[PDB]
Amino acid sequence: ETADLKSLAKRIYEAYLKNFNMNKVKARVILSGSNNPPFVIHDMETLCMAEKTLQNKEAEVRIFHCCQCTSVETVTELTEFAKAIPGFANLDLNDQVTLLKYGVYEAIFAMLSSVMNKDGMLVAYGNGFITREFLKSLRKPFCDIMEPKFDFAMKFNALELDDSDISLFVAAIICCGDRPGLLNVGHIEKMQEGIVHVLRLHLQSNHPDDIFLFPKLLQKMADLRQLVTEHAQLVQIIKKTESDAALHPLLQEIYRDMY
Numbered sequence: 001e002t003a004d005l006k007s008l009a010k011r012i013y014e015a016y017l018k019n020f021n022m023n024k025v026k027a028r029v030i031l032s033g034s035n036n037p038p039f040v041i042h043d044m045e046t047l048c049m050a051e052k053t054l055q056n057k058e059a060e061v062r063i064f065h066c067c068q069c070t071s072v073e074t075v076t077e078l079t080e081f082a083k084a085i086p087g088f089a090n091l092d093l094n095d096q097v098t099l100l101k102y103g104v105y106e107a108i109f110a111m112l113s114s115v116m117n118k119d120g121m122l123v124a125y126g127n128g129f130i131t132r133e134f135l136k137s138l139r140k141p142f143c144d145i146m147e148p149k150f151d152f153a154m155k156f157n158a159l160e161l162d163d164s165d166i167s168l169f170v171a172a173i174i175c176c177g178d179r180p181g182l183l184n185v186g187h188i189e190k191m192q193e194g195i196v197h198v199l200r201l202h203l204q205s206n207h208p209d210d211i212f213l214f215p216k217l218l219q220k221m222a223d224l225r226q227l228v229t230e231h232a233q234l235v236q237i238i239k240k241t242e243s244d245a246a247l248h249p250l251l252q253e254i255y256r257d258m259y
């Protein structure tokens with residue numbers, strides 16, 4: 001109706017505020033501070049320094065591993081976030097895992113842009129900031145992991161979305177009817193339609209200065225799926241060629257069902 005949309009939107013936004021320890025506003029308040037600045041990692045010296053306060057494998061592999069720790073935590077938060085999206089809990093458990101299974105990485109990269117600026121990104125729960133040049137100085141193929149995400153982030157951040165916009169966007173990413181193997185594809189479809197509808201109305205209302213934001217945001221979902229398959233391919237390549245580089249068991253299984 002009209003109160004049903006406020007209801008849908010509000011419940012989704014509160015879930016977002018509840019379940020994600022880190023969000024765009026909080027990351028911005030840090031990249032600007034002061035409330036204890038973020039330790040900077042721009043070289044091996046500071047990297048080891050930062051690790052000693054935030055294994056014994058090669059540097060590149062230790063980072064590969066920490067990025068995975070971040071993903072695992074985000075997958076957990078996304079699951080709790082999803083259970084709160086109106087109608088998600090009513091879905092069959094198999095449909096819930098299928099949705100989470102096929103949509104966590106799109107959601108992860110959609111949200112990672114929040115902690116990134118053109119010079120680097122926030123790590124260690126906000127207490128650290130790693131340099132983009134440093135990530136690029138890493139041995140190949142490890143230096144190829146983050147750079148593409150920075151390319152995406154700069155274009156995504158150019159849209160200037162705030163957390164309320166992002167919470168709706170992530171909800172739309174998760175409640176996808178295209179995911180293979182869905183049981184009640186019809187209900188999920190109704191959810192998707194309602195979420196995309198309120199997202200668009202919310203954008204027009206939250207961003208009156210850019211009436212073309214909705215379409216530009218939708219183009220991003222497209223670039224995200226692309227970024228993800230490219231990411232998944234690089235992770236497989238690294239795990240397969242680099243003997244010390246391993247894949248966390250949960251992430252290994254998620255990657256198995258995506259393709």
Ligand SMILES: CCO[C@@H](Cc1ccc(OCCc2ccc(OS(C)(=O)=O)cc2)cc1)C(=O)O
Pocket residue numbers: 041047051054062063064066067068070071072121122123124130145235251
């Ligand atoms: C390379 C593994 O990629 C992850 C996705 C990912 C990628 C990057 C990412 O970036 C988080 C930022 C970060 C950068 C460095 C880091 O290491 S450190 C040693 O500086 O703490 C920790 C987090 C989060 C998830 C996967 O496939 O699950």
Ligand code: NA
Pocket residue numbers: 189
């Ligand atoms: Na249909």
